[PDB]
Amino acid sequence: SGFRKMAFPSGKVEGCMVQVTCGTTTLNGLWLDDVVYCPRHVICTSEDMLNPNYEDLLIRKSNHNFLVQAGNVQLRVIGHSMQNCVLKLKVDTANPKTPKYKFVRIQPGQTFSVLACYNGSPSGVYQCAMRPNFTIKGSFLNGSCGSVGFNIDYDCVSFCYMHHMELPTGVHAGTDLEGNFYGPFVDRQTAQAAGTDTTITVNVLAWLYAAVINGDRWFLNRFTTTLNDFNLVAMKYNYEPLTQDHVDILGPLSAQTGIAVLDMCASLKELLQNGMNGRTILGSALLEDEFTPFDVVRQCSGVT
Amino acid sequence: SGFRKMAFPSGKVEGCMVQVTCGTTTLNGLWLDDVVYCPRHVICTSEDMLNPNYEDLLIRKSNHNFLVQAGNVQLRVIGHSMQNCVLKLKVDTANPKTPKYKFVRIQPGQTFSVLACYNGSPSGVYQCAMRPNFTIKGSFLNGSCGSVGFNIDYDCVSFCYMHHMELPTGVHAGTDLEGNFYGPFVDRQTAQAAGTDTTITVNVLAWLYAAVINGDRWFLNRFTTTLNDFNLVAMKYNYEPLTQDHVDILGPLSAQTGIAVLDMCASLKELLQNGMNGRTILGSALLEDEFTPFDVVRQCSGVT
Numbered sequence: 034s035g036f037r038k039m040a041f042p043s044g045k046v047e048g049c050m051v052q053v054t055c056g057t058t059t060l061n062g063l064w065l066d067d068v069v070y071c072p073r074h075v076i077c078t079s080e081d082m083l084n085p086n087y088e089d090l091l092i093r094k095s096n097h098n099f100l101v102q103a104g105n106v107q108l109r110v111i112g113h114s115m116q117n118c119v120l121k122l123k124v125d126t127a128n129p130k131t132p133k134y135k136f137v138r139i140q141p142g143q144t145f146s147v148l149a150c151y152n153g154s155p156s157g158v159y160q161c162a163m164r165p166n167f168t169i170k171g172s173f174l175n176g177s178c179g180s181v182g183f184n185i186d187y188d189c190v191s192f193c194y195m196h197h198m199e200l201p202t203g204v205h206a207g208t209d210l211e212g213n214f215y216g217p218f219v220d221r222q223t224a225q226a227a228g229t230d231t232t233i234t235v236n237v238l239a240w241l242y243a244a245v246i247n248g249d250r251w252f253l254n255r256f257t258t259t260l261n262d263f264n265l266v267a268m269k270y271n272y273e274p275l276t277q278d279h280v281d282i283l284g285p286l287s288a289q290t291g292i293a294v295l296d297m298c299a300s301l302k303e304l305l306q307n308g309m310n311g312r313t314i315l316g317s318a319l320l321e322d323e324f325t326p327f328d329v330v331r332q333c334s335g336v337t
Numbered sequence: 338s339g340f341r342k343m344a345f346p347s348g349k350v351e352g353c354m355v356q357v358t359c360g361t362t363t364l365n366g367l368w369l370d371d372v373v374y375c376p377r378h379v380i381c382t383s384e385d386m387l388n389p390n391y392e393d394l395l396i397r398k399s400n401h402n403f404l405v406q407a408g409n410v411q412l413r414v415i416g417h418s419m420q421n422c423v424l425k426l427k428v429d430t431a432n433p434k435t436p437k438y439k440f441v442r443i444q445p446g447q448t449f450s451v452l453a454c455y456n457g458s459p460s461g462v463y464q465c466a467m468r469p470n471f472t473i474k475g476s477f478l479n480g481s482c483g484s485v486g487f488n489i490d491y492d493c494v495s496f497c498y499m500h501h502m503e504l505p506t507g508v509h510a511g512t513d514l515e516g517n518f519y520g521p522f523v524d525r526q527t528a529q530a531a532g533t534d535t536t537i538t539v540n541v542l543a544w545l546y547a548a549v550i551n552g553d554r555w556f557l558n559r560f561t562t563t564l565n566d567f568n569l570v571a572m573k574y575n576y577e578p579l580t581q582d583h584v585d586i587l588g589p590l591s592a593q594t595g596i597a598v599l600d601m602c603a604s605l606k607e608l609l610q611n612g613m614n615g616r617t618i619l620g621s622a623l624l625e626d627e628f629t630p631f632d633v634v635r636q637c638s639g640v641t
């Protein structure tokens with residue numbers, strides 16, 4: 034028993050982290066096979082970031098201008114290309130530590146682990162979610178760009194995120210491994226509206242099922258609701274509307290606990306309308322939404 | 338900016354995890370050099386755990402009865418010995434992935450990362466603290482025994498915890514890597530009193546400094562207090578008494594923000610007496626205590 038915000042073991046990703054320097058800028062890159070992936074803003078100075086023409090800036094750069102270091106050894110760059118907001122640096126050596134991998138573009142509300150890196154060296158690993166407004170609430174300092182988000186399925190690492198920037202609001206924006214930003218964000222130092230950050234309803238319900246499984250049951254009530262009645266409450270509290278697809282994904286948790294999804298919705302409705310009254314659920318005084326239904330099942334079953 | 342419950346990158350520890358089987362019991366072990374460390378209760382059945390005589394049970398076991406598997410390869414056991422509540426299995430092969438390591442017995446209130454494992458395979462990594470009552474609030478299922486807690490300083494892994502048991506209360510007890518339990522716990526299935534779980538005051542203050550650094554400032558007030566006045570409040574709220582040693586450890590954070598330690602104590606005093614009034618600090622609706630002052634500095638400076 035016990036429920037923690039658990040991240041995937043980061044070893045497979047640590048073996049892919051490299052340092053990329055271009056001119057006076059240094060950030061992290063991801064070395065898989067003979068390609069190093071990194072944010073294209075490695076070619077920029079702070080002066081350039083106000084309004085950069087990436088194509089014009091990249092023309093002034095050659096393979097020898099991209100310094101790629103894996104630990105204490107230098108990689109030889111034999112090709113460079115820009116794909117959306119990422120640079121792909123072809124090197125002459127395949128990473129001997131390349132795990133089985135995929136590049137995936139996750140959905141808002143899905144979770145992933147982040148391996149925060151500086152100068153190609155990992156500092157820590159934490160779990161987070163892609164918010165409905167396509168930002169992530171991470172922990173990144175200057176130099177963390179190029180740090181990646183990922184999920185692991187047995188031996189296969191699915192890379193879903195590459196860190197690019199911090200918005201003036203203190204939240205984070207980045208791209209998938211094809212260089213496309215999640216959300217409307219651009220790699221420019223300009224005013225960028227994140228959008229309303231709603232609560233991921235299906236994840237709160239999954240975490241409520243995790244609470245019951247691990248003994249926290251005080252919030253269970255004698256009520257039920259309907260999807261339309263529950264959604265009127267979810268609208269009022271800036272929660273995502275719950276759909277039958279979400280009900281279906283909560284099926285296994287509903288089966289494990291014997292608590293119908295709509296009965297758990299009535300518990301959540303009452304918690305939204307009445308608050309926690311100073312009580313906690315799984316060591317939290319607020320409703321947690323960065324655990325998907327898959328995460329709760331995985332953690333409660335011990336998948337390695 | 339941003340503040341997360343960050344764990345150390347687990348790669349160095351993943352390379353040490355092995356599966357240990359004895360009779361019908363399977364748990365995890367830690368392979369460093371030519372020794373595999375695991376909980377001594379690997380020699381027990383469920384029948385034995387009610388009142389085991391470890392010395393008498395171990396006499397019936399030989400080197401060939403301890404099955405040690407590293408991935409898909411079998412390790413040859415050439416020696417076995419019991420040190421406190423851990424077994425040390427000498428194998429004929431040094432772990433080629435052994436990192437620089439130390440065995441350390443941490444203090445209550447200190448934090449560490451846990452790599453939860455099942456059948457010698459890692460499932461996840463999370464950060465936690467040794468509670469003042471010497472329990473840890475982890476996430477462990479049956480088969481997780483032998484999973485380890487650790488800290489990393491540049492290239493050196495300091496192993497501080499090995500998981501042994503779950504108390505009927507749902508909290509966790511374990512040993513240092515010399516096999517000595519943290520707290521009064523014994524490796525027996527019996528009624529065990531955890532003790533009052535107090536809040537780690539120095540860690541709450543460090544997290545309050547982390548909040549100010551990352552922009553959350555609403556809780557700052559026009560007041561100050563003294564150590565003795567603050568401690569009267571800390572006593573009432575089951576908080577650890579704050580000492581001048583704790584004030585001294587908060588020195589760098591106090592210097593960084595320009596907020597005197599006793600002024601931050603007055604902010605904490607007011608939060609204890611008045612609550613959060615529905616507000617949050619660093620995404621939390623309660624006072625967080627599993628970030629040491631060293632952790633806040635490390636995360637806010639980007640140490641790799």
Ligand SMILES: O=C(Nc1cncc2ccccc12)[C@@H]1CCNc2ccc(Cl)cc21
Nearest residue numbers: 074082173174175197198199220221222338
């Ligand atoms: O945001 C960026 N980097 C960071 C990333 N994360 C956390 C940071 C914390 C503190 C300083 C920098 C941080 C960079 C720096 C310049 N401005 C800028 C503008 C657009 C783009 Cl694409 C990248 C950047």
Ligand SMILES: O=C(Nc1cncc2ccccc12)[C@@H]1CCNc2ccc(Cl)cc21
Nearest residue numbers: 034378386477478479501502503524525526
């Ligand atoms: O506690 C133990 N293991 C576990 C460890 N962690 C989380 C568990 C969750 C669910 C079932 C088992 C779990 C073992 C099992 C038997 N009882 C027992 C008694 C004493 C000692 Cl030293 C070990 C044990």
